[PDB]
Design a protein around this ligand. Structure first.
Ligand SMILES: CCC(O)(CC)CS[C@H](C)C1=CC[C@H]2/C(=C/C=C3C[C@@H](O)C(OCCO)[C@H](O)C3)CCC[C@]12C
Lengths: 11, 238
Protein backbone atom coordinates (compact mmCIF):
# COMPACT_ATOMS: atom_id res chain seq x y z
CA UNK A 1 0.00 0.00 0.00
CA UNK A 2 2.53 2.54 -1.29
CA UNK A 3 5.88 0.98 -0.34
CA UNK A 4 7.93 1.96 -3.44
CA UNK A 5 11.37 0.83 -2.30
CA UNK A 6 10.11 -2.37 -0.69
CA UNK A 7 8.05 -3.17 -3.78
CA UNK A 8 10.99 -2.50 -6.11
CA UNK A 9 13.22 -4.81 -4.07
CA UNK A 10 10.55 -7.52 -4.35
CA UNK A 11 9.98 -7.26 -8.09
CA UNK B 1 11.14 -39.46 6.26
CA UNK B 2 11.93 -36.23 4.39
CA UNK B 3 10.65 -36.43 0.83
CA UNK B 4 12.71 -35.20 -2.12
CA UNK B 5 10.70 -32.00 -1.97
CA UNK B 6 11.50 -31.37 1.68
CA UNK B 7 15.21 -31.88 1.06
CA UNK B 8 14.78 -29.60 -1.96
CA UNK B 9 13.15 -26.92 0.20
CA UNK B 10 16.06 -27.03 2.67
CA UNK B 11 18.74 -26.84 -0.03
CA UNK B 12 16.92 -23.83 -1.49
CA UNK B 13 16.77 -22.03 1.87
CA UNK B 14 20.39 -22.81 2.71
CA UNK B 15 21.54 -21.28 -0.60
CA UNK B 16 19.22 -18.28 -0.17
CA UNK B 17 20.82 -17.62 3.21
CA UNK B 18 24.34 -18.06 1.86
CA UNK B 19 23.57 -15.47 -0.83
CA UNK B 20 22.17 -12.98 1.70
CA UNK B 21 24.41 -13.40 4.76
CA UNK B 22 28.07 -12.44 4.32
CA UNK B 23 30.05 -13.67 7.38
CA UNK B 24 33.03 -11.55 6.29
CA UNK B 25 30.93 -8.48 7.06
CA UNK B 26 32.91 -6.51 4.46
CA UNK B 27 29.94 -4.29 3.51
CA UNK B 28 29.86 -2.76 7.01
CA UNK B 29 32.55 -0.39 5.78
CA UNK B 30 29.90 1.39 3.67
CA UNK B 31 27.83 2.30 6.75
CA UNK B 32 28.11 5.62 8.56
CA UNK B 33 30.89 5.26 11.17
CA UNK B 34 29.94 3.88 14.59
CA UNK B 35 30.49 6.44 17.35
CA UNK B 36 30.91 5.26 20.94
CA UNK B 37 23.58 10.95 22.84
CA UNK B 38 22.34 8.45 20.25
CA UNK B 39 25.84 8.39 18.79
CA UNK B 40 25.29 4.83 17.53
CA UNK B 41 21.98 5.47 15.75
CA UNK B 42 23.46 6.49 12.38
CA UNK B 43 25.61 3.36 12.23
CA UNK B 44 22.96 0.91 13.50
CA UNK B 45 20.30 2.52 11.28
CA UNK B 46 22.51 1.76 8.27
CA UNK B 47 23.20 -1.72 9.62
CA UNK B 48 19.45 -2.33 9.88
CA UNK B 49 18.72 -0.84 6.45
CA UNK B 50 21.31 -3.16 4.87
CA UNK B 51 19.79 -6.04 6.82
CA UNK B 52 16.26 -5.24 5.61
CA UNK B 53 17.63 -5.52 2.07
CA UNK B 54 19.13 -8.94 2.80
CA UNK B 55 16.01 -10.27 4.52
CA UNK B 56 13.95 -9.22 1.48
CA UNK B 57 16.31 -11.12 -0.82
CA UNK B 58 16.06 -14.15 1.44
CA UNK B 59 12.25 -13.95 1.51
CA UNK B 60 11.90 -13.87 -2.28
CA UNK B 61 13.67 -17.21 -2.42
CA UNK B 62 11.27 -18.90 0.05
CA UNK B 63 9.49 -21.60 -2.00
CA UNK B 64 5.94 -20.35 -2.53
CA UNK B 65 6.54 -16.81 -1.28
CA UNK B 66 6.44 -15.66 -4.90
CA UNK B 67 2.87 -16.95 -5.27
CA UNK B 68 1.46 -14.42 -2.80
CA UNK B 69 -0.03 -11.08 -3.82
CA UNK B 70 2.24 -8.06 -4.01
CA UNK B 71 0.20 -6.74 -1.08
CA UNK B 72 0.63 -9.92 0.98
CA UNK B 73 4.38 -10.04 0.29
CA UNK B 74 4.62 -6.42 1.47
CA UNK B 75 2.57 -7.06 4.61
CA UNK B 76 4.67 -10.06 5.65
CA UNK B 77 8.01 -8.31 5.19
CA UNK B 78 7.00 -5.12 7.01
CA UNK B 79 5.77 -7.11 10.01
CA UNK B 80 8.52 -9.72 10.21
CA UNK B 81 11.52 -7.63 9.11
CA UNK B 82 12.63 -6.65 12.60
CA UNK B 83 12.04 -10.23 13.80
CA UNK B 84 14.11 -11.85 11.04
CA UNK B 85 16.93 -9.36 11.63
CA UNK B 86 16.97 -10.25 15.33
CA UNK B 87 16.89 -13.91 14.33
CA UNK B 88 19.63 -13.81 11.67
CA UNK B 89 21.77 -11.68 13.99
CA UNK B 90 22.18 -14.73 16.26
CA UNK B 91 24.90 -15.82 13.81
CA UNK B 92 27.15 -12.90 14.84
CA UNK B 93 26.03 -12.94 18.49
CA UNK B 94 28.57 -14.50 20.86
CA UNK B 95 27.92 -15.70 24.41
CA UNK B 96 31.61 -15.09 25.11
CA UNK B 97 30.63 -11.55 26.13
CA UNK B 98 26.97 -11.27 25.11
CA UNK B 99 27.64 -9.08 22.07
CA UNK B 100 27.13 -9.10 18.30
CA UNK B 101 30.63 -9.61 16.91
CA UNK B 102 30.82 -8.74 13.22
CA UNK B 103 34.49 -9.29 12.38
CA UNK B 104 36.15 -6.44 14.27
CA UNK B 105 36.11 -4.21 17.35
CA UNK B 106 34.47 -1.35 15.45
CA UNK B 107 31.77 -3.79 14.38
CA UNK B 108 31.26 -5.49 17.73
CA UNK B 109 28.00 -4.31 19.26
CA UNK B 110 27.07 -4.60 22.94
CA UNK B 111 24.28 -3.43 25.27
CA UNK B 112 25.71 0.08 25.63
CA UNK B 113 25.87 0.53 21.87
CA UNK B 114 22.20 -0.42 21.50
CA UNK B 115 21.51 1.94 24.38
CA UNK B 116 23.34 4.61 22.36
CA UNK B 117 20.84 3.94 19.56
CA UNK B 118 17.99 5.17 21.76
CA UNK B 119 16.74 1.92 23.27
CA UNK B 120 16.09 0.98 26.91
CA UNK B 121 16.58 -2.17 28.97
CA UNK B 122 12.94 -3.13 28.44
CA UNK B 123 13.95 -4.19 24.93
CA UNK B 124 17.67 -4.89 25.30
CA UNK B 125 17.44 -7.35 28.20
CA UNK B 126 14.83 -9.62 26.64
CA UNK B 127 16.73 -9.26 23.35
CA UNK B 128 19.97 -10.57 24.83
CA UNK B 129 18.03 -13.27 26.70
CA UNK B 130 16.49 -14.26 23.35
CA UNK B 131 19.90 -14.39 21.65
CA UNK B 132 21.13 -16.41 24.61
CA UNK B 133 18.20 -18.83 24.44
CA UNK B 134 18.47 -19.24 20.68
CA UNK B 135 22.18 -19.96 20.96
CA UNK B 136 21.37 -22.58 23.64
CA UNK B 137 19.39 -24.54 21.05
CA UNK B 138 22.53 -25.04 18.95
CA UNK B 139 20.35 -25.21 15.84
CA UNK B 140 21.68 -26.81 12.67
CA UNK B 141 22.04 -24.20 9.93
CA UNK B 142 19.21 -26.11 8.22
CA UNK B 143 16.94 -25.42 11.21
CA UNK B 144 18.07 -21.78 11.37
CA UNK B 145 17.05 -20.99 7.79
CA UNK B 146 13.76 -22.89 8.12
CA UNK B 147 12.88 -20.85 11.22
CA UNK B 148 13.51 -17.55 9.45
CA UNK B 149 11.38 -18.68 6.50
CA UNK B 150 8.60 -19.81 8.86
CA UNK B 151 8.79 -16.48 10.69
CA UNK B 152 8.35 -14.56 7.42
CA UNK B 153 5.34 -16.49 6.13
CA UNK B 154 3.07 -16.19 9.19
CA UNK B 155 -0.74 -16.22 8.58
CA UNK B 156 -1.69 -14.11 11.60
CA UNK B 157 0.30 -11.06 10.49
CA UNK B 158 -1.79 -7.85 10.72
CA UNK B 159 -3.17 -6.80 7.36
CA UNK B 160 -2.77 -10.22 5.76
CA UNK B 161 -5.18 -10.91 2.90
CA UNK B 162 -4.96 -14.44 1.57
CA UNK B 163 -4.30 -15.94 5.01
CA UNK B 164 -5.25 -19.38 3.63
CA UNK B 165 -2.44 -19.35 1.08
CA UNK B 166 0.06 -17.96 3.57
CA UNK B 167 -0.83 -20.70 6.06
CA UNK B 168 -0.50 -23.37 3.37
CA UNK B 169 3.00 -22.18 2.45
CA UNK B 170 4.11 -22.00 6.09
CA UNK B 171 2.64 -25.44 6.85
CA UNK B 172 4.85 -26.92 4.12
CA UNK B 173 7.83 -25.26 5.80
CA UNK B 174 6.75 -26.38 9.28
CA UNK B 175 6.26 -29.98 8.21
CA UNK B 176 9.69 -29.76 6.59
CA UNK B 177 11.25 -28.58 9.86
CA UNK B 178 9.40 -31.06 12.08
CA UNK B 179 10.49 -33.93 9.85
CA UNK B 180 14.09 -32.68 9.62
CA UNK B 181 14.47 -32.62 13.38
CA UNK B 182 13.10 -36.14 13.75
CA UNK B 183 15.27 -37.54 10.94
CA UNK B 184 18.44 -35.43 11.19
CA UNK B 185 18.66 -34.03 14.71
CA UNK B 186 20.04 -36.66 17.12
CA UNK B 187 18.89 -36.80 20.75
CA UNK B 188 19.27 -35.29 23.30
CA UNK B 189 19.48 -32.05 21.30
CA UNK B 190 16.25 -32.84 19.45
CA UNK B 191 14.16 -33.16 22.61
CA UNK B 192 11.19 -30.79 22.26
CA UNK B 193 13.25 -28.94 19.67
CA UNK B 194 10.28 -27.99 17.48
CA UNK B 195 8.21 -26.56 20.34
CA UNK B 196 11.27 -24.69 21.58
CA UNK B 197 11.76 -23.08 18.16
CA UNK B 198 8.10 -22.09 17.89
CA UNK B 199 8.44 -20.57 21.34
CA UNK B 200 11.24 -18.43 19.90
CA UNK B 201 8.73 -17.16 17.33
CA UNK B 202 6.46 -16.19 20.23
CA UNK B 203 9.40 -14.39 21.89
CA UNK B 204 9.95 -12.51 18.63
CA UNK B 205 6.34 -11.22 18.53
CA UNK B 206 6.95 -9.77 21.99
CA UNK B 207 10.31 -8.33 20.93
CA UNK B 208 8.69 -6.94 17.77
CA UNK B 209 6.04 -5.33 19.97
CA UNK B 210 8.49 -3.64 22.32
CA UNK B 211 10.82 -2.57 19.51
CA UNK B 212 7.93 -0.92 17.68
CA UNK B 213 7.05 1.14 20.77
CA UNK B 214 10.58 2.39 21.32
CA UNK B 215 10.94 2.97 17.57
CA UNK B 216 7.77 5.07 17.36
CA UNK B 217 8.90 7.10 20.36
CA UNK B 218 12.38 7.45 18.91
CA UNK B 219 11.16 8.16 15.36
CA UNK B 220 8.54 10.61 16.64
CA UNK B 221 11.18 13.30 17.04
CA UNK B 222 12.23 14.62 13.57
CA UNK B 223 15.89 14.96 14.56
CA UNK B 224 16.09 11.19 15.20
CA UNK B 225 13.92 10.23 12.24
CA UNK B 226 16.38 12.36 10.29
CA UNK B 227 19.22 9.95 11.12
CA UNK B 228 17.47 6.86 9.77
CA UNK B 229 17.36 5.69 6.16
CA UNK B 230 14.62 5.96 3.53
CA UNK B 231 14.18 2.15 3.49
CA UNK B 232 14.01 1.95 7.28
CA UNK B 233 11.31 4.65 7.37
CA UNK B 234 9.30 2.98 4.63
CA UNK B 235 9.45 -0.51 6.14
CA UNK B 236 9.26 0.28 9.87
CA UNK B 237 6.63 2.94 9.23
CA UNK B 238 6.86 6.70 8.82
C1 LIG C 1 17.41 1.26 13.17
C2 LIG C 1 16.44 0.68 14.22
C3 LIG C 1 16.98 0.46 15.67
O1 LIG C 1 15.95 -0.09 16.50
C4 LIG C 1 17.44 1.81 16.29
C5 LIG C 1 16.37 2.88 16.56
C6 LIG C 1 18.24 -0.41 15.70
S1 LIG C 1 18.82 -1.09 17.30
C7 LIG C 1 17.86 -2.65 17.56
C8 LIG C 1 17.73 -3.02 19.05
C9 LIG C 1 18.52 -3.86 16.79
C10 LIG C 1 17.82 -4.84 16.18
C11 LIG C 1 18.78 -5.87 15.54
C12 LIG C 1 19.94 -5.67 16.51
C13 LIG C 1 21.38 -6.18 16.12
C14 LIG C 1 21.70 -6.68 14.87
C15 LIG C 1 22.85 -7.16 14.24
C16 LIG C 1 23.15 -7.63 12.98
C17 LIG C 1 22.11 -7.75 11.86
C18 LIG C 1 22.39 -8.89 10.87
O2 LIG C 1 21.45 -8.74 9.80
C19 LIG C 1 23.85 -8.82 10.34
O3 LIG C 1 24.17 -9.78 9.28
C20 LIG C 1 25.01 -9.17 8.27
C21 LIG C 1 24.99 -10.24 7.17
O4 LIG C 1 23.87 -10.09 6.30
C22 LIG C 1 24.81 -9.08 11.57
O5 LIG C 1 24.54 -10.34 12.16
C23 LIG C 1 24.62 -8.04 12.72
C24 LIG C 1 22.37 -5.97 17.28
C25 LIG C 1 22.41 -4.48 17.72
C26 LIG C 1 20.98 -3.84 17.86
C27 LIG C 1 20.04 -4.11 16.63
C28 LIG C 1 20.52 -3.28 15.37
Amino acid sequence: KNHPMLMNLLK
Amino acid sequence: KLSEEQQHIIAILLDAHHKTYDPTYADFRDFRPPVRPLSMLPHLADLVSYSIQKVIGFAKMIPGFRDLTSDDQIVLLKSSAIEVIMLRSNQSFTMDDMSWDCGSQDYKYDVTDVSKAGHTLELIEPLIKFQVGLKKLNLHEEEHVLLMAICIVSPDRPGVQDAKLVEAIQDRLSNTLQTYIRCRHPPPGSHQLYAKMIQKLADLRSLNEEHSKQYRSLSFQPENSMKLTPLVLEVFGN
